Design a binder for this molecule. Structure first.
Ligand SMILES: *[C@@H]1O[C@H](CO)[C@@H](O[C@@H]2O[C@H](CO)[C@@H](O[C@@H]3O[C@H](CO[C@H]4O[C@H](CO[C@H]5O[C@H](CO)[C@@H](O)[C@H](O)[C@@H]5O[C@H]5O[C@H](CO)[C@@H](O)[C@H](O)[C@@H]5O)[C@@H](O)[C@H](O[C@H]5O[C@H](CO)[C@@H](O)[C@H](O)[C@@H]5O[C@H]5O[C@H](CO)[C@@H](O)[C@H](O)[C@@H]5O)[C@@H]4O)[C@@H](O)[C@H](O[C@@H]4O[C@H](CO)[C@@H](O)[C@H](O)[C@@H]4O)[C@@H]3O)[C@H](O)[C@H]2NC(C)=O)[C@H](O)[C@H]1NC(C)=O
Ligand SMILES: *[C@@H]1O[C@H](CO)[C@@H](O[C@@H]2O[C@H](CO)[C@@H](O[C@@H]3O[C@H](CO[C@H]4O[C@H](CO[C@H]5O[C@H](CO)[C@@H](O)[C@H](O)[C@@H]5O)[C@@H](O)[C@H](O[C@H]5O[C@H](CO)[C@@H](O)[C@H](O)[C@@H]5O)[C@@H]4O)[C@@H](O)[C@H](O[C@H]4O[C@H](CO)[C@@H](O)[C@H](O)[C@@H]4O)[C@@H]3O)[C@H](O)[C@H]2NC(C)=O)[C@H](O)[C@H]1NC(C)=O
Ligand SMILES: *[C@@H]1O[C@H](CO)[C@@H](O[C@@H]2O[C@H](CO)[C@@H](O[C@@H]3O[C@H](CO[C@H]4O[C@H](CO)[C@@H](O)[C@H](O[C@H]5O[C@H](CO)[C@@H](O)[C@H](O)[C@@H]5O)[C@@H]4O)[C@@H](O)[C@H](O)[C@@H]3O)[C@H](O)[C@H]2NC(C)=O)[C@H](O)[C@H]1NC(C)=O
Ligand SMILES: *[C@@H]1O[C@H](CO)[C@@H](O[C@@H]2O[C@H](CO)[C@@H](O[C@@H]3O[C@H](CO)[C@@H](O)[C@H](O)[C@@H]3O)[C@H](O)[C@H]2NC(C)=O)[C@H](O)[C@H]1NC(C)=O
Ligand SMILES: *[C@@H]1O[C@H](CO)[C@@H](O[C@@H]2O[C@H](CO)[C@@H](O)[C@H](O)[C@H]2NC(C)=O)[C@H](O)[C@H]1NC(C)=O
Ligand SMILES: *[C@@H]1O[C@H](CO)[C@@H](O)[C@H](O)[C@H]1NC(C)=O
Ligand SMILES: *[C@@H]1O[C@H](CO)[C@@H](O)[C@H](O)[C@H]1NC(C)=O
Ligand code: NA
Ligand code: NA
Ligand code: NA
Length: 971
């Protein structure tokens, strides 16, 4: 419409006038605040065979101060866009304004709690509040569009605009979506708009009038977000209606799953992301992702492919620090999980199978395509008798762990065939799914059919190579049209049969851990078992430069096949040297199939490597791996300095500079006040981290109890003191976001002044998933209070959150990073704090009573260069009954962890190189808040590493780490 770079028809999207099956992975730039590491994520995504990445932009981080959009330094998106382009990955931009994403406010900055309008509606105040952010982010995205030589090809307006409740009846509001769309277009956005309906409801589909997007898309998370039972696949959870609904809701556009389950989030007191990785494992992928292909999906994005970390309080209360998500690429960026390797097999199948996009999805059947009803097959039939067809097979009961033998009865250019034709039966093992192919094209050679799955294929000059694989214990068969005979050119000929049947040469074989290569004419067919296929890679090879280029027919055709190990990032030909960039985590045998004619030498990670060439023209070599020594500090043995970070609990404390909580009104349109003045922190500009309230009053001697209702979000906690006397604490739980408590008080002297100090942990602002719920407006602070024997107005309040509130002090680390604790307000969490007069006490000694202390220490690192080494800070928790205490982890000023001993479940906190300095000094800081009478201390706290990966990744540049500087107006 507005451009010709990205177009579409009923079958697929076209990029540069060429059909492209778009297989994407979700990555959030703000969850990995290290520019140097973006290229790593993109290369790992490209290595899966993917060609696109989908990303959100978090408004709360870019306009923390209303009226001032700021996306510089670690918040700069340019390095993210540049890495995508460098890696040859396109982008789907999803700026919101509302993104949900399990982030604080669902993306909404805390000041939205002061906006007099229902969020995500046409209410004037809400729309106006989004204008500054929307115009700025759209302009930034506009410059990176493919129409301007950038990687961005699609744009998503809003996010899961799919439902309302609670009094708001304007949904769906055509003019609302049209407003977002018009504003983006006015900002320069010309690429197509794609939606992401929460479910297949057809909202904003083409033809629905105002607000309609260009390509209708929807989401799906079939296994849910509770990973407690990783091996349980509930009955009926596998969707079977996506194609039907698509033809009814948006038949004119390519079927698109903008968000398809790639893992799951986990709540405070949850089960841990390891279980989520186990639930959404390699079996889940092959069964559910191939099920998506059975619907003819042309755009598939997996949420998440890499989750990252909710550092600096950017996450919502419904989750904790980690956002590992159990995705293919872990929080520490590793790709050891089997799900990564399995996904690579499907990604590479899609990349070399144009026939799949033009095939017509049909209805599933338990009788038409096999000899047993225990199996279900969904056909994707070619346009004519000679066109390629695909058959997605699975157990009829998708959760079945049974092994079933069968025979495939499918239509082909040679008529209806019953396979195997040479005898025996095929096997579908537990929780597996396969895509059988017929009349599949391999550079002009017709593969009449293949039961074993296609990993990849290439034409190297006059030689053709096809890579097939089957799972353990399977018998397979394939046929090549017009072929006369075959020869086993590698491996034993045992179990391999070859016979000319009709106008095709049929070859039968049994899966083995040993590779067999069968030569059929000019075609070399590699016969592999799944686990061997896991080690193959298909890097693109550009003629000029080192960048692979985007994925298209041409770059796909000039790619090569490399058998290696942990990872193969890229390859390029420089003169007569074939360069391969890869990572290794063990001794790795190397094989290169299809080295360019001009290539004479093999260079791996810049090192000339000894290679030999075999009868099949395969280059072979080996890369040695020797685990290097990784010297890490013993945290317990470091020199620690500490300071009381609750000076408010002393009679000498002066809070005159604090904000007076004196508004006899609230700007929160969803919650009326129950106190004389507003005690909702957002009404005063405090939206993140620890919040403190101090209520001053003159006693009348009749006081006995102090009732109070606090609210800090799920898993929050609070602690109270009256002058220097401890009153009590609400240690919190995984199911409470607020708490009502009546505390008794010591006797007070009439005529004397007292102050009640209430410290409240803020776990972030809630999302607003259902429009009209206004859940994002759930306040943080004091909701109710009553001092017995006194009028509520007898107490005058002061409050504080992060120093300066919306006029936040750390422009480099963002509006959410630091909370309101004394040490944070002073900036003591930054490198080189003023510890000269501090005490020499460590967190291992801790506190012997309720309170909050801040700790500091430093240590130097000089880790092995040339290695990608994940570092984690681990807290011990071997005790049966957990002590009640909260910890905030600060590394070089960046908060990278909120630890709640009594709630969990996180004990291991990864921190990326870039935040940590691997060849310099590091400043570690911790706040320790004891919420029990016995006090609190750390029993075990260590810095550990996991497998050092021999890498080709460039040196990681340390991000800006502003050192401590005395702050004006601090208190
Ligand atoms: C360096 O990086 C690499 C990555 O690049 C890291 O390697 C990855 O490590 C992962 C662990 O962290 C690992 O995942 C676990 O795998 C467990 C093993 O099961 C799988 O493998 C079986 C075959 O073993 C061979 O391959 C694996 C690796 O794939 C290897 O570890 C073995 O040593 C062995 O290798 C040798 O053979 C291959 C060729 O075959 C050669 O290439 C090698 O050189 C060696 O010679 C395989 O049978 C199994 O599949 C069966 O079981 C799964 C379910 O577990 C089914 O889905 C599947 O259908 C199949 O079941 C059928 O067949 C069997 C056998 O006939 C039959 O009995 C059944 O009835 C059915 O018919 C797997 O692919 C796995 O147990 C484990 O799972 C965990 O535990 C339980 C399992 O009970 C599970 O429910 C949990 O969810 C949990 O995940 C993991 O999946 C990756 O596979 C591995 N990837 C690669 C590429 O190697 C490496 O660790 C890292 N190094 C360091 C130091 O960090
Ligand atoms: C370090 O290791 C330790 C273990 O050594 C580990 O501690 C465990 O952590 C888990 C996860 O956080 C704890 O399990 C959860 O506990 C939740 C809290 O339970 C208590 O509080 C509940 C809420 O009470 C308040 O609110 C309600 C409602 O507003 C109100 O009525 C109350 O008055 C109060 O204000 C309360 O409901 C609950 O009561 C049950 O248990 C008591 C005690 O037996 C019993 O007397 C009651 O009759 C009732 O049965 C209890 O007082 C809990 O809410 C939560 O349950 C939800 O989630 C689970 C899934 O996990 C669901 O199955 C369930 O249906 C709920 O939705 C869950 O049980 C666990 O208690 C800790 N273990 C111990 C021994 O302390 C740390 O997390 C680890 N730390 C790290 C860093 O990893
Ligand atoms: C701590 O104690 C408080 C109460 O002191 C608990 O909160 C109350 O919980 C009960 C039980 O769930 C709720 O009762 C329901 O009330 C429904 C009617 O709600 C309206 O009328 C209420 C009475 O005045 C009013 O409080 C409530 O306010 C809410 O909506 C307003 C409009 O959006 C908004 O301005 C307010 O801020 C607030 O969100 C409504 O106007 C009734 O239909 C149900 O049958 C049931 O009786 C109370 O409504 C809750 N009170 C409030 C103010 O929310 C709280 O759960 C306790 N905490 C814990 C952990 O137990
Ligand atoms: C790759 O990154 C992931 C995610 O950061 C790392 O996974 C974590 O690995 C540890 C160590 O294996 C797991 O903890 C262990 O759990 C078992 C089972 O309870 C327990 O017996 C051990 O004592 C230990 O606690 C942890 O659960 C897991 N976390 C997640 C989120 O999956 C993995 O270690 C990294 N791999 C490499 C090589 O870097
Ligand atoms: C409770 O704490 C308050 C501080 O908020 C004390 O009042 C202050 O006391 C200091 C020291 O005498 C004076 O310099 C301040 O001017 C006082 N401020 C106020 C608001 O009165 C108060 O004395 C303490 N109460 C008791 C009995 O210890
Ligand atoms: C061949 O198979 C198709 C589909 O399985 C079936 O409809 C047809 O009757 C069979 N015979 C013909 C006409 O080729
Ligand atoms: C907050 O409320 C006050 C008093 O009603 C009003 O003057 C002010 O404009 C409001 N702020 C916003 C953001 O609406
Ligand atoms: Na080629
Ligand atoms: Na424990
Ligand atoms: Na735990």
């Amino acid at each position: 419409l507005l451009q010709k770079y990205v177009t579409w028809d009923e079958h697929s999207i076209f990029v540069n006038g060429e059909r492209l099956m778009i297989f994407s992975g979700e990555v959030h730039p703000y969850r990995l605040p290290v520019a140097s590491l973006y290229i790593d994520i993109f290369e790992k995504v490209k290595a899966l065979g993917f060609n696109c990445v989908s990303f959100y932009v978090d408004w709360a981080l870019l306009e923390g101060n209303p009226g001032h959009y700021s996306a510089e330094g670690i918040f700069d998106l340019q390095p993210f866009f540049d890495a995508a382009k460098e890696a040859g990955i396109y982008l789907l931009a999803r700026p919101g304004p509302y993104i949900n994403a399990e982030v604080s406010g669902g993306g909404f900055p805390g000041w939205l709690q002061r906006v007099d309008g229902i969020l995500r509606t046409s209410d004037e105040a809400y729309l106006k509040a989004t204008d500054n952010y929307a115009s700025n982010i759209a302009a930034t995205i506009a410059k990176a569009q493919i129409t301007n030589g950038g990687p961005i090809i699609l744009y998503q307006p809003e996010n899961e605009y799919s439902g309302a409740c609670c009094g708001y009846n304007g949904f769906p509001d055509g003019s609302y979506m049209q407003y977002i769309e018009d504003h983006a277009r006015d900002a320069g956005i010309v690429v197509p708009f794609i939606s992401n309906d929460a479910w297949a409801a057809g909202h904003n589909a083409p033809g629905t009038g105002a607000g309609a997007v260009d390509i209708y898309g929807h989401d799906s998370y079939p296994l849910g977000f509770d990973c407690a039972n990783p091996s349980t696949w509930p009955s009926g959870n596998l969707p079977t209606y996506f194609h039907t609904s698509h033809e009814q809701q948006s038949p004119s556009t390519p079927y698109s799953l903008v968000e398809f389950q790639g893992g799951a989030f986990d709540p405070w007191g949850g089960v841990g992301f390891a279980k989520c990785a186990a639930l959404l494992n390699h079996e889940f992928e092959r069964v559910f992702y191939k099920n998506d292909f059975s619907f003819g999906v042309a755009f598939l994005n997996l949420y998440m492919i890499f989750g990252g970390t909710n550092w600096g309080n950017l996450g919502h209360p419904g989750g904790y620090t980690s956002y590992d998500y159990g995705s293919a690429i872990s929080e520490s960026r590793n790709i050891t999980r089997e799900k990564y390797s399995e996904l690579k097999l499907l990604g590479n199948f899609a990349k070399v199978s144009p026939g799949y996009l033009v095939a017509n999805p049909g209805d599933l059947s338990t009788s038409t395509y096999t000899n047993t009803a225990d199996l279900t097959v969904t056909p994707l039939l070619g346009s004519n008798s000679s066109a390629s067809s695909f058959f997605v097979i699975r157990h009829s009961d998708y959760s079945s762990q049974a092994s079933v033998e069968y025979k495939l009865t499918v239509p082909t250019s040679a008529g209806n065939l019953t396979i195997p034709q040479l005898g025996g039966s095929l096997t579908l093992s537990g929780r597996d799914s396969k895509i059988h192919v017929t009349d599949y094209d391999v550079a002009g050679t017709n593969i009449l059919y293949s039961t074993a799955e296609v990993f990849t294929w290439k034409k190297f000059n006059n030689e053709k190579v096809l890579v097939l694989y089957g799972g353990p214990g399977e018998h397979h068969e394939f046929a090549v049209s017009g072929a006369s005979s075959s020869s086993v050119v590698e491996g034993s000929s045992s179990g391999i049969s070859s016979k000319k049947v009709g106008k095709a040469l049929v070859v039968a074989w049994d899966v083995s851990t040993a590779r067999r290569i069968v030569q059929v004419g000019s075609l070399k067919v590699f016969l592999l078992d799944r686990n061997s296929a896991y080690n193959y890679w298909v890097p693109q090879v550009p003629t000029k430069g080192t960048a692979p280029g985007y994925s298209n027919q041409e770059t796909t055709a000039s790619s090569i096949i490399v058998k290696a190990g942990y990872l193969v990032r890229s390859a390029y030909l420089d003169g007569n040297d074939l360069h391969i960039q890869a990572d290794f985590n063990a001794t790795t045998p190397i094989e290169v199939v299809g080295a360019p004619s001009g290539a004479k030498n093999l260079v791996i990670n810049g090192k000339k490597t000894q290679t030999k060439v075999d009868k099949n023209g395969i280059w072979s070599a080996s890369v040695a791996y020797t685990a290097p020594k990784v010297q890490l500090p013993s945290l317990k043995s470091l020199k620690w300095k500490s300071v009381d970070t609750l000076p408010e609990a002393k009679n000498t404390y002066d809070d005159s500079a604090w904000t007076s909580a004196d508004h006899a009104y609230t700007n929160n349109s969803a919650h009326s006040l129950q106190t004389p003045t507003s005690l909702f922190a957002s009404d005063y500009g405090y939206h993140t981290g620890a919040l403190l309230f101090r209520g001053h009053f003159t006693a009348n001697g009749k006081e006995k109890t102090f009732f109070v209702q606090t609210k800090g979000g799920t898993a929050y906690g609070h602690s109270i003191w009256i002058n220097e006397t401890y009153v009590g604490s609400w240690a919190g739980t995984s199911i409470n976001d607020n708490n009502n408590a009546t505390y008794t008080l010591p006797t007070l002297q009439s005529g004397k002044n007292y102050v009640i100090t209430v410290v409240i942990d803020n776990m972030g602002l809630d999302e607003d998933w259902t429009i009209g719920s206004e859940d994002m407006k759930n306040p943080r602070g004091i909701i109710q209070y009553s001092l017995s024997g006194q009028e509520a107005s007898a107490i005058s309040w002061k409050l504080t959150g992060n120093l300066g509130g919306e006029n936040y002090r750390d422009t480099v680390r963002g509006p959410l990073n630091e909370g309101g604790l004394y040490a944070e307000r002073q900036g003591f969490h930054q490198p080189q704090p003023p510890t000269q007069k501090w005490d020499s006490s460590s967190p291992f000694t801790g506190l012997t009573k309720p309170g909050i202390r801040f700790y500091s220490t430093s240590f130097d690192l000089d880790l092995p260069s040339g290695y990608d080494i994940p570092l984690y800070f681990n807290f011990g928790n071997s005790t049966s009954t957990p002590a009640a205490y909260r910890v905030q982890l600060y590394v070089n000023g960046y908060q990278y962890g909120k630890y709640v001993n009594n709630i969990g479940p996180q004990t291991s906190f990864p921190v990326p190189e870039g935040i940590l300095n691997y060849h310099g000094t590091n400043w570690l800081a911790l706040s320790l808040w004891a919420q029990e009478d016995n006090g609190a201390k750390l029993d075990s706290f260590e810095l550990i590493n996991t497998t050092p990966v021999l890498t080709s990744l460039g040196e990681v540049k340390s991000v800006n780490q502003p050192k401590y500087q005395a702050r004006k107006g601090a208190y």
